[PDB]
Amino acid sequence: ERLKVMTIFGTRPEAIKMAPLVLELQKHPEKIESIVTVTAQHRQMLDQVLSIFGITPDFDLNIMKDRQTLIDITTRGLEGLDKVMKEAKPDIVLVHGDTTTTFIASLAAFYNQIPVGHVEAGLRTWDKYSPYPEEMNRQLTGVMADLHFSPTAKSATNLQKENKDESRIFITGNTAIDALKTTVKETYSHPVLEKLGNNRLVLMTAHRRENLGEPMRNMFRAIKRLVDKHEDVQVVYPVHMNPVVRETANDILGDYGRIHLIEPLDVIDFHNVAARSYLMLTDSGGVQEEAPSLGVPVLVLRDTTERPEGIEAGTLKLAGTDEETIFSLADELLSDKEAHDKMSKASNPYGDGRASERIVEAILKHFNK
Amino acid sequence: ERLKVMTIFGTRPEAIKMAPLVLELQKHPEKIESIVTVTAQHRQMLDQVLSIFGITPDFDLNIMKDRQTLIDITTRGLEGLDKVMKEAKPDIVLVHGDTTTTFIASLAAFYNQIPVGHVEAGLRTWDKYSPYPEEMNRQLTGVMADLHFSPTAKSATNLQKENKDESRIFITGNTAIDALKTTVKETYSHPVLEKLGNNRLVLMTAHRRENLGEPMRNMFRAIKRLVDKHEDVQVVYPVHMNPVVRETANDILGDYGRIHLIEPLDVIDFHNVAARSYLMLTDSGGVQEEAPSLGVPVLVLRDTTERPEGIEAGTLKLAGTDEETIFSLADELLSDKEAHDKMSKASNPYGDGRASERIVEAILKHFNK
C-alpha cells in the first residue's frame, strides 16, 4: 500500500521549484502515489511548465489572490485545503517556501494530523515586517513542519538554532537547479538568439523599485560603455517598459543597435536564453542561485549580498550599484577568457541538480519505506 | 497621546489570569488607554470576575467552540478579531496561554501589523501532538509575539533555546497570583467557615482521572486517621460524588461532623477558603502554583510532580496516593508547627504577586513611553 504524497503548487514560480520533485516522486510508483494539488489563480505558464515536466494535476483549487485581502486568502485557502486533504487523505503534504498558501496548507495538514515536508526551509531575516508576510509565513510553516529541506547550510543552521529536531533537517540544495536538466533544450529558437547570432550576450535583470533612480542610470551608462568597448557583444534587458524607463533608456542607451530592452521572458525562455549567455548582470536571488549551474558568470548589482556562499565559491561577484565597478568587472570578464572560464567552471554551492533525490530519500526513510 | 493596549479574554479560566493585568493597566490612565475584548463562550463566571475587578468590556464576540471544528473556530475567530482590531486600532494586543483563540488573535494582530504580547509564554512539551492542538498553538503564537511574559526561568529558557531575542523575554511570574490581593477579602463568610472555629482547616481537592478508585479510598482512610489523631482539625472536600462514591466516603469517615463533603467552590469562594486553610492536599497543577502565595503548605496527591520549582523551593511536597505516605506527611505538618510554619513561609517561585506590574513596565519601556 503506497505512501500517498500530496505536492502543493500554490503559485507560478513554485511550478519550476516543485515540478522536479514531482518527477522524482513519479519514479517510485511501487512505493509512492504522487498527488499534485494546484491552487494558483494564474495557470497558463504553470500549465506550460507542468506540460514540459509531464505532470497532470490531480486537484485544482482556485484560491483567488488579485485584489484579495490576507484574511480572505487565509480563510478560503484554509477551508479548501482542509477539504482536499479530507478528500485525498495523503500521508504527507509537501509545501514550498514562504507563501501564505504554504502557511495555511501547513495549518490544514496540522488540523488533520498530516505530516508536512517543507521545501526550501530556514531562510530568516528575523524582521516580521520585511518581507511581509513572507518572513512570518516561513517561521509559522517552520513550527508545523515535520521535515525541513534547506537549500544551504546557512538555512539548515537557522532551524537548528530554533531547536528543531536535527534528524528532520536536510541540506538538499535548491530544487530550481534540478529543473534545468529538463527545461534547457540542446536546441532552442527565440528572437533574442536569432538577433544574437555568434555575438556574446550579456543578459541583465534588475528589479525596477530597488534600482529606481541613480542605480539604473549607472547600469545604463555602464552597459553603454561595454558595447562601446566590445563590438561582438549584445546586452539584453528583459523588463516591463513604462515611459519612465523608455525615456531613461533612450536618453543614455541610444539606438546603436546592440542594446535591446525586451518584454519579460517566461521561465522556459529565460532558462534557455540564460543557458546561452556569456555573462549575467542581476539583482535576483534566484538568478544568483540558478544561473551558475548553466556555466554563466553572474555579477550582482548590489553593494551588499545575502548570498555569501556564491561569492566565496566564485560563481558570483559583487558589482555594486556604481557605474565604474559595474563596467570594470563586466569588461574584465568580457576581455579575459581565463577570468570568464574560472567563474564559469566554479561549482554552484546552492545545488548539484539532485535536491529532489535527497528530498524523496528523506521522505522514504522517514516513513521506513 | 496614549498607548492603546488591548487585552483578550478568550476562555473562562483567563478571567482570573488577565483581570489583574487589566487592573494594572487601569492604574496608568494618562499613558495607557486600556481596551478589553471578551471572546469566551461561557460568560457567567467571567462576568462575575470582571465585575469584582471593576472591568467593563469594550468588545464582546461570541466565538462558539461547542461541537465546533478547529477550521471554523480559526476562520470565524480570525474574521471577528480582525474586525475588532481594524476598529479599535490597538498599539499592542495581549494574549494568554495556549488556546486556538490566542493563536488567531495573534494572527489577526500580525495581519494588521499590530504587536503582540504573550502572557504566560514558554511552556514546552516539544511534542507537536501532545497536547493537541495546545503545544502547536503556543509555538505559533511564539513566533508571532513581540514580547514574551514567562512565568518561570524554565519557560524563558525554552524560548531562549528557540533563538528568541532575550531582550523580548521577561520572567514576570504567574499573573493568577496577582489576583489574590483583589479576590481575598478579610471580611468574607462561608457556611463551611462558620462551622470551623479557631480549628485548623485541611482543604482537600482531587479531580484527576488517575485518582479515581483506590487513590480516593486511600485519601479518605488517611483523613479518617488524621481527624482521629488531631481533635482540633476539620477537613473540607469540595467535590461532587456519584452516590456509590458518597457511600464509600461515609463508610470510611462516618458522620462525626468534622469532615465536610460539599459541592465544588467557585474561584472566589475557593480563594478565600484556601486563604483560611492550615494545610492543602491537591492533585491540581494550578493550586500548586497559587495556593502557596497564601502561606498554605501544599501536599500533592501524586507520586511525581509537574511543578519541580515548587518542590525545590519547599512550597510543595509529594504525598503519593498510598494511604501511609498521605497520612505520614499530613500528620508531620499537623503535629509540628515548625515544619508547617516553614512551608507556610517559603517563597512561591511561580510569582510574588507583581507579574502584572512587570508586564506593564515591559510594555511602557518597549514603546518608549
Ligand SMILES: CNC(=O)[C@H]1C[C@H](OC(F)F)CN1C(=O)c1cnc2c[nH]nc2c1
Ligand atoms: C527567484 N527569482 C526568479 O524568479 C529567477 C529565476 C530565474 O533565474 C534563473 F534562470 F537563473 C528567472 N528569475 C528572475 O529573477 C528573472 C528576472 N528578470 C527577468 C526578466 N524576464 N524573466 C526574468 C526572470
Ligand SMILES: CNC(=O)[C@H]1C[C@H](OC(F)F)CN1C(=O)c1cnc2c[nH]nc2c1
Ligand atoms: C487548575 N487550576 C485551577 O483551576 C485552580 C486555581 C485555584 O487554585 C488556587 F486558588 F490555588 C482553584 N483551582 C482548582 O484546581 C480547584 C480545585 N478544587 C476545587 C474545588 N472547588 N473549586 C476548586 C478549584
